Design a protein around this ligand. Structure first.
Ligand SMILES: CC[C@@H](C)n1ncn(-c2ccc(N3CCN(c4ccc(OC[C@H]5CO[C@](Cn6cncn6)(c6ccc(Cl)cc6Cl)O5)cc4)CC3)cc2)c1=O
Ligand code: HEM
Length: 531
């Protein structure tokens, strides 16, 4: 028995491999991990304690392209092939999707030790907002921060915000070049241009106050734009690749946080701390339960986080509302009648209380959030091995879980004629969200314990949104004034555009233009201006 000869030929063979043409070796450097990846999947496909894994040809990339461009179609095909639980590789990571209310339950109500949101999100958010807040702190710090922010989002705060938001909308109609209602009776706008502006203007004025709003009338506004461009999906993958807009992002957050800090310190020095805005509120109520106070820098950062949170979700949403109503003059008509009924033909001034008596307007917001969940995919990093009840499936630590209530929003099974815009599906159910059972408190107020609602635009569990009532307040005022003031429709041959799933939120694909017309051509908006 002499296999020794063969053992020699192993060594000889490696040496020959080392000698190969400098190009052929490169080609091997491609084909070998290519083949390994394929064999690996086939091997993986034999495991019974793993959810099925979506096949992919290109290593590391995985299903990035198809998921990135059309995640709901991707999910539907996957669901057809595998059912509700399945995995797919995404830019070096394994994402395990759990579709439907069970998935909502599995991810949003996961134990604190099983999953981490901050491990999923911090490397995008921390550079944008700053240190020590949101996802750059332990979850218990986040919980209290959310408690602090909620303390400025009370009914009394909303009562005070409504005239301020209304004033901003009217000023925008008066002064913005997109409108100029005192000099033009009709015009064309791109809602992806107007809505982000109206959003930052109304959220600035109400949450941050008059000074900070006033700063947006200057080239300081460009910092917000710079900051905004650091809030993009690529920063999930590549958080710190050296380029110009990364530096501009960092500079922006320093500059903006600096401006907030400047105002905070001035207010403290002057004993000018009232109950006007979120800044006042946080200055008065910013101490953790262990007695550590948030620093002025952390307060500033938290303000950035909060304004950024409401910015894209709300802007995308009012864009979609305008776009759906543009081909539904019947709905604009019905909403107008409700406006005339509730505001006494317009001789009642809009208030927060009267907003609560506009069920069809609120249903319109609700239905838009059903058809256009701003965030098509929410993530968590799995921290401990997770057994999927009731299967043999185990989700290993190091995986990520992906939940998508927005996908369920669009399933006929849970919403008949799901692809039809029908505000009347919410008749006698016009509230932003409804807890169908018992409640629980994670630190920022009692919220629904079960997260099995097929409708979940604000998510649930410990990471649940706290801006929902502010968003309804802002969208409410905004659409109330739009409706009473204007009618609008599409250019010929235009209709509702498809979503752009590649950005941070599911905003419409641009340009998304509508034509407005004044209901009262001779109506003038008062106040001083220089145009
Ligand atoms: C480039 C190649 C191409 C083919 N490709 N390949 C893949 N993709 C892709 C994949 C996925 C996605 N995304 C879209 C964005 N999405 C996402 C974005 C934000 C997000 O936020 C969750 C947390 C953090 O931010 C906020 C958002 N928010 C909540 N309420 C208001 N805003 C948040 C929470 C708290 C605070 Cl204070 C601020 C903020 Cl912003 O919630 C979660 C998911 C993930 C999937 C985009 C592109 C591509 O485009
Ligand atoms: C209608 C618009 C909005 C929608 C659809 C929306 C959606 C959501 C969703 C789905 C979550 C859960 C995130 C997750 O589980 O990963 C969330 C969380 C949150 N939202 Fe919003 N949101 C909206 C507006 C706002 C506004 C106006 C604010 C600020 C006032 C805000 C601040 C937050 C915060 C602070 C969180 C906490 C995230 C966490 O705890 O990890 N949102 N939002």
């Amino acid at each position: 028995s002499i296999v020794g000869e063969a053992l020699e030929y192993v060594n000889i063979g490696l040496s020959h491999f080392l000698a190969l043409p400098l190009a052929q070796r490169i080609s091997l450097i491609i084909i070998i991990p290519f083949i390994y990846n394929i064999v690996w999947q086939l091997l993986y496909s034999l495991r019974k304690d793993r959810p099925p894994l979506v096949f992919y040809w290109i290593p590391w990339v995985g299903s990035a392209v198809v998921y990135g461009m059309k995640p709901y179609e991707f999910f539907e095909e996957c669901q057809k092939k595998y059912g509700d639980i399945f995995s797919f590789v995404l830019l070096g990571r394994v994402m395990t999707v759990y579709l439907g209310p069970k998935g909502h339950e599995f991810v949003f109500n996961a134990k604190l030790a099983d999953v981490s949101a901050e491990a999923a999100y911090a490397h995008l958010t921390t550079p944008v907002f700053g240190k020590g807040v949101i996802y750059d702190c332990p979850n218990s710090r986040l919980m209290e921060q959310k408690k602090f922010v909620k303390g400025a989002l009370t009914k009394e705060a909303f009562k005070s915000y409504v005239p301020l938001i209304a004033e901003e909308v009217y000023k925008y109609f008066r002064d913005s070049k997109n409108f100029r209602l005192n000099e033009r009776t009709t015009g064309t706008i791109d809602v992806m241009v107007t809505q982000p502006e109206m959003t930052i203007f109304t959220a600035s004025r109400s949450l941050l106050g008059k000074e900070m709003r006033a700063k947006l009338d200057t080239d300081f506004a460009y910092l917000y734009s710079d900051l905004d461009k650091g809030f993009t999906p690529i920063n999930f993958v590549f958080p710190n690749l050296p380029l110009e807009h990364y530096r501009k992002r960092d500079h922006a957050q320093k500059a903006i946080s600096g401006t907030y800090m400047s105002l905070i310190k001035e207010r403290r020095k002057n004993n000018d701390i009232q109950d006007r805005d979120l800044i006042d509120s946080l200055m008065k109520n910013s101490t953790y339960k262990d007695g550590v106070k948030m620093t002025d820098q952390e307060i500033a950062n938290l303000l950035i986080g909060v304004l950024m949170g409401g910015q894209h979700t709300s802007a995308a949403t009012s864009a979609w509302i305008l776009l759906h109503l543009a081909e539904r003059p019947d709905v604009q008509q019905e909403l107008y009648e409700e406006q005339m009924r509730v505001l006494d033909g317009g001789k009642k001034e809009l208030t927060y209380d009267l907003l609560q008596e506009m069920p069809l307007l609120n249903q319109t917001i609700k239905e838009t959030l059903r058809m256009h969940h701003p965030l098509h995919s929410l993530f968590r990093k799995v921290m401990k091995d997770m057994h999927v009840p009731n299967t043999s499936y185990v989700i290993p630590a190091g995986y990520h879980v992906l939940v998508s209530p927005g996908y369920t929003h669009l399933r006929d099974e849970y919403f008949p004629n799901a692809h039809q815009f029908n505000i009347h599906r919410w008749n006698n159910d016009s509230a932003s969200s409804y807890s169908v059972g018992e409640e629980v408190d994670y630190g920022f107020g009692a919220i629904s314990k079960g997260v099995s609602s097929p409708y979940l635009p604000f998510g649930g569990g410990r990471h649940r949104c706290i801006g929902e009532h502010f968003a309804y307040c802002q969208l409410g005022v905004l659409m109330s004034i739009f409706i009473r003031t204007l009618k609008w429709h599409y250019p010929e041959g235009k209709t509702v555009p498809p979503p752009d799933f590649t950005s941070m939120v599911t905003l419409p694909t641009g340009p998304a233009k509508i034509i407005w017309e004044k209901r009262n051509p001779e109506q003038k908006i008062g106040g001083r201006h220089h145009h």
